[PDB]
Amino acid sequence: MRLRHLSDPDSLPALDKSFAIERPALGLAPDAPPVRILLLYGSLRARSFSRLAVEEAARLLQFFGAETRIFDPSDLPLPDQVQSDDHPAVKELRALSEWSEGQVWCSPERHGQITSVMKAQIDHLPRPTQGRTLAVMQVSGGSQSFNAVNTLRLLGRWMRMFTIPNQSSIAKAFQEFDAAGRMKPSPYYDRIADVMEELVRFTALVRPHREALTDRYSERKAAGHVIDEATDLSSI
Amino acid sequence: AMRLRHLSDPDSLPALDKSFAIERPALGLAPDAPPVRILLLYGSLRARSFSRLAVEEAARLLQFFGAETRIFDPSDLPLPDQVQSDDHPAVKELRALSEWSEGQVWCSPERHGQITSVMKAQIDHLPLEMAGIRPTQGRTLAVMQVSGGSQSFNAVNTLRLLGRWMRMFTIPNQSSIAKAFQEFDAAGRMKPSPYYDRIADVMEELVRFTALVRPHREALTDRYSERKAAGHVIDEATDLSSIAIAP
Amino acid sequence: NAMRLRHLSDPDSLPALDKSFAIERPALGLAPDAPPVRILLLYGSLRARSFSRLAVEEAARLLQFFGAETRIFDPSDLPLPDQVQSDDHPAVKELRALSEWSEGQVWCSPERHGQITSVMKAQIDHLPLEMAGIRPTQGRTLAVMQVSGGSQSFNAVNTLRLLGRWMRMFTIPNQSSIAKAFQEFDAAGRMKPSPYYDRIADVMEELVRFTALVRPHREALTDRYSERKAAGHVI
Amino acid sequence: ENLYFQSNAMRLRHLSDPDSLPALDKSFAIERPALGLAPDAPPVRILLLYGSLRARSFSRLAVEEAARLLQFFGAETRIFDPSDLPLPDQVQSDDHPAVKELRALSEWSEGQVWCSPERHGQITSVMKAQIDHLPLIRPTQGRTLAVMQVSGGSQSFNAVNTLRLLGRWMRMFTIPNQSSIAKAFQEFDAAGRMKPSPYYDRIADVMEELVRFTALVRPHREALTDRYSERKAAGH
Ligand SMILES: [Ca+2]
Ligand SMILES: [Cl-]
Numbered sequence: 001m002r003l004r005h006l007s008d009p010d011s012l013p014a015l016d017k018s019f020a021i022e023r024p025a026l027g028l029a030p031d032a033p034p035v036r037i038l039l040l041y042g043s044l045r046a047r048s049f050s051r052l053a054v055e056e057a058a059r060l061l062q063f064f065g066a067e068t069r070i071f072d073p074s075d076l077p078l079p080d081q082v083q084s085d086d087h088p089a090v091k092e093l094r095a096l097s098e099w100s101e102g103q104v105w106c107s108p109e110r111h112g113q114i115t116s117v118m119k120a121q122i123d124h125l126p127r128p129t130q131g132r133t134l135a136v137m138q139v140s141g142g143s144q145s146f147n148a149v150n151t152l153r154l155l156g157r158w159m160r161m162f163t164i165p166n167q168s169s170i171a172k173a174f175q176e177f178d179a180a181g182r183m184k185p186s187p188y189y190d191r192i193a194d195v196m197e198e199l200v201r202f203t204a205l206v207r208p209h210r211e212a213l214t215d216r217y218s219e220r221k222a223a224g225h226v227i228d229e230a231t232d233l234s235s236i
Numbered sequence: 237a238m239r240l241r242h243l244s245d246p247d248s249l250p251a252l253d254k255s256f257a258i259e260r261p262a263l264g265l266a267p268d269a270p271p272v273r274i275l276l277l278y279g280s281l282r283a284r285s286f287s288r289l290a291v292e293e294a295a296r297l298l299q300f301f302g303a304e305t306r307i308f309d310p311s312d313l314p315l316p317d318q319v320q321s322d323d324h325p326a327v328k329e330l331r332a333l334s335e336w337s338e339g340q341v342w343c344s345p346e347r348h349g350q351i352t353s354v355m356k357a358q359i360d361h362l363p364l365e366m367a368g369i370r371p372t373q374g375r376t377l378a379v380m381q382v383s384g385g386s387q388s389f390n391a392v393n394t395l396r397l398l399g400r401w402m403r404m405f406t407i408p409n410q411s412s413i414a415k416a417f418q419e420f421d422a423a424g425r426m427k428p429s430p431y432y433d434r435i436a437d438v439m440e441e442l443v444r445f446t447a448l449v450r451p452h453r454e455a456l457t458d459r460y461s462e463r464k465a466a467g468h469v470i471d472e473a474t475d476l477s478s479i480a481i482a483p
Numbered sequence: 484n485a486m487r488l489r490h491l492s493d494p495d496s497l498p499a500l501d502k503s504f505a506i507e508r509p510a511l512g513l514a515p516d517a518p519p520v521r522i523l524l525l526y527g528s529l530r531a532r533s534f535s536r537l538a539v540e541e542a543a544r545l546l547q548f549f550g551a552e553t554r555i556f557d558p559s560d561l562p563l564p565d566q567v568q569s570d571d572h573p574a575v576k577e578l579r580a581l582s583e584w585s586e587g588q589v590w591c592s593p594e595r596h597g598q599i600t601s602v603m604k605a606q607i608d609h610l611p612l613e614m615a616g617i618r619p620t621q622g623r624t625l626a627v628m629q630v631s632g633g634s635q636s637f638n639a640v641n642t643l644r645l646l647g648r649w650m651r652m653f654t655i656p657n658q659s660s661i662a663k664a665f666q667e668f669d670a671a672g673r674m675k676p677s678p679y680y681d682r683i684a685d686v687m688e689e690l691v692r693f694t695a696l697v698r699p700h701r702e703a704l705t706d707r708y709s710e711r712k713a714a715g716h717v718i
Numbered sequence: 719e720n721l722y723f724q725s726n727a728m729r730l731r732h733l734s735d736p737d738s739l740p741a742l743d744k745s746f747a748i749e750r751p752a753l754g755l756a757p758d759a760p761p762v763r764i765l766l767l768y769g770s771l772r773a774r775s776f777s778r779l780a781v782e783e784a785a786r787l788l789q790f791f792g793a794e795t796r797i798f799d800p801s802d803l804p805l806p807d808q809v810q811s812d813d814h815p816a817v818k819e820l821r822a823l824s825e826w827s828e829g830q831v832w833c834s835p836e837r838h839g840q841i842t843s844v845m846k847a848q849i850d851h852l853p854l855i856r857p858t859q860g861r862t863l864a865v866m867q868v869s870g871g872s873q874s875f876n877a878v879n880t881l882r883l884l885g886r887w888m889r890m891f892t893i894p895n896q897s898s899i900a901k902a903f904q905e906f907d908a909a910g911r912m913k914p915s916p917y918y919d920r921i922a923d924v925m926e927e928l929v930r931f932t933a934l935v936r937p938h939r940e941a942l943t944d945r946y947s948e949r950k951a952a953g954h
């Protein structure tokens with residue numbers, strides 16, 4: 001199956017547990033069953049800082065009591081390749097999307113743009129995406145910029161997902177990951193912690209109200225769904 | 237508060253089809269009492285401002301949906317640093333209104349195809365922190381724009397980025413009125429249209445998300461990196477019992 | 484005035500410039516450089532120590548050395564659009580007159596909140612495409628600049644470029660983006676020798692050349708097929 | 719059976735009915751827009767690039783109308799056919815016949831026109847592939863550029879804005895006027911000719927401005943690119 005294996009999932013050496021709240025959603029909304037998050041990365045390279053960033057994000061999410069799933073786009077058809085939504089990878093990507101209650105997208109910024117593999121993934125998400133939350137992240141080999149995360153945010157908005165305000169943008173990514181692929185203790189890691197903390201809190205909050213949040217006035221008008229006793233006549 | 241726009245004919249919504257309007261959108265979702273508090277900002281000082289008039293329609297809708305509204309009047313708002321330290325009654329009022337709000341609506345027209353200076357000036361005067369206060373953080377935001385031509389998203393997109401910078405939960409739905417001048421009558425009211433229905437959807441969504449987010453503003457803004465920096469060590473062995481069980 | 488023009492201190496002091504490689508008349512051989520190319524410079528902050536203003540002042544010294552006449556607008560009393568009925572305020576009138584006077588412009592804004600400031604935008608907003616048969620921006624050249632407290636970015640210059648485009652200005656390709664700008668200026672407000680300074684020299688050199696090249700053809704370049712068609716068969 | 723083999727092909731689009739401009743009002747068009755402005759002999763050389771390989775590509779069709787207008791204004795034009803140019807996710811090679819030809823065309827050009835559909839907020843992969851293969855200091859510097867876009871929905875400027883900044887990165891001089899066709903499918907007749915509209919009039923303005931500005935700057939490419947910092951770096 002096209003899922004990435006999270007090695008040492010409980011090993012969080014860059015996290016200061018004296019400050020990390022184990023259960024961020026406690027008091028906001030029920031945490032059972034665990035909040036479901038699908039994580040997507042935008043690099044095919046063996047040593048992808050996008051994936052490794054996504055993996056650190058996953059470890060943090062699991063620590064916060066969330067259930068995670070990291071999609072492996074290795075064989076997902078790329079944008080210019082033979083498209084067919086009957087493709088096994090496309091089908092599994094859709095399945096994971098319907099599964100998730102919230103999502104994390106992480107893309108490298110290649111010259112002010114997100115990557116083909118990131119686009120391909122987004123293009124193959126089911127407006128079935130309505131009401132799911134989203135956290136955006138980017139990595140770059142150069143100076144910190146926000147073009148990729150801003151692009152991701154607007155794509156998420158177009159799909160009617162709720163993109164949280166906090167986001168991650170790692171500058172000179174190569175300097176932040178050791179040989180083992182783990183992330184070094186830094187403000188950047190602290191930021192991913194914050195983003196995942198916020199995403200758990202917000203997802204737990206919005207997840208039980210998906211129906212109601214997507215029950216729109218214009219949709220009721222178009223369908224002729226006259227509100228339960230909104231008139232002075234006996235319904236219906 | 238001196239700098240508030242008077243909302244005329246507040247309860248008359250002729251463009252809204254009330255057989256489909258839910259009067260209390262947050263009911264069953266989250267407590268809607270007291271009324272959710274919404275601050276609305278517009279981006280032109282022109283007498284016949286379509287951004288102001290769209291904001292006024294938004295306000296009527298919010299009130300219909302049971303919100304309490306305030307529309308800031310930026311007519312004497314100085315440019316940042318125009319008046320020393322920005323110590324100006326208009327800045328103090330806008331800042332106080334932001335703190336009061338639980339959610340906000342920002343509506344800008346385009347000048348030279350971009351967000352107006354009037355709109356920017358107001359947002360610029362909202363700080364992330366000031367004397368232990370964070371007047372925008374953990375509040376919801378709905379973005380809207382108007383234009384004289386074909387439907388545009390330049391302004392709403394910029395507004396969305398600003399709201400993110402201000403750490404606001406910006407709702408996905410938004411409004412962009414194309415050829416705005418065709419949509420408003422001599423009395424400044426919007427005629428029935430998909431644009432109007434869109435604004436209704438946007439305010440309905442804002443009310444729902446605001447009611448949901450407001451009881452947890454402090455929690456959503458209680459950040460790991462901030463606790464670490466301040467040195468606020470988390471003791472679950474003593475201070476966990478203080479947090480009540482979620483409904 | 485109030486005054487609404489900034490005085491340029493030590494205008495002939497260019498220690499960060501190596502005159503042995505500078506061409507004092509960059510337009511010589513391209514287009515007439517007399518009378519002086521007229522450049523209006525605008526900055527994006529009213530803060531006491533404004534790096535956007537300081538960078539613009541370095542730009543102005545360079546321009547004058549390259550044979551330009553310059554005006555640096557001070558927007559300290561500029562009202563927001565429509566804050567004064569019909570924008571009938573001396574600051575607006577002066578800014579518009581300065582734009583009309585110009586043959587090219589320099590806009591320099593700090594990048595804040597990932598955008599250009601409201602002070603920068605207020606000045607641009609007050610520039611009309613056309614007012615009473617006058618087009619005070621169209622066909623003029625533009626150079627864009629930005630300053631930042633952090634690493635080098637281009638959001639402000641990109642926004643400025645797109646505004647210049649709307650104003651139908653010929654925006655030169657070279658541009659300036661000073662990163663960690665606090666490190667680049669001394670206590671007296673002068674820019675330290677660096678690649679950032681050399682860039683400004685290049686940008687002003689390019690601006691003088693294009694301004695001299697474009698200026699004799701402003702009318703022709705702004706005489707458009709669609710507008711002729713709109714005006715119909717005169718008379 | 720096979721006795722003959724072919725490889726001697728040119729990647730240029732044929733312009734049908736080049737002198738047929740029914741949407742243009744000739745009483746208001748200036749046939750030599752640079753006359754009296756800058757020398758218009760030899761003809762200004764314009765390379766045009768479009769952003770879709772689809773049969774009824776409105777991007778290509780808008781570019782064809784632009785080419786006709788340019789030829790009317792006395793320019794020589796070349797429209798590159800990117801049908802066999804490898805796309806960004808495919809194997810890349812500088813020795814590829816399509817790359818060499820595109821680069822030859824870029825060198826020949828004094829100005830360029832780039833027209834792309836805007837898909838969701840971005841330019842196309844075929845447009846990208848072409849721009850990627852122009853550059854290799856910038857050899858493209860000093861050439862002028864006019865940007866155009868087409869969209870299936872309301873008029874937007876995301877594609878032209880992207881093209882403009884790509885042009886700027888390559889130190890081309892992008893003219894201020896530009897074309898953005900809204901609901902492009904509505905603006906072309908069955909034969910692929912553009913209907914008279916303010917959109918067609920705009921393309922006329924753009925090509926008029928491009929001919930004028932290109933004639934103006936082309937004799938001075940050397941001096942315009944003789945830079946203080948480069949002279950300093952050279953030494954002496
Ligand atoms: Ca002097
Ligand atoms: Cl620079």
Ligand SMILES: [Cl-]
Pocket residue numbers: 644648654882886892893
């Ligand atoms: Cl440009």
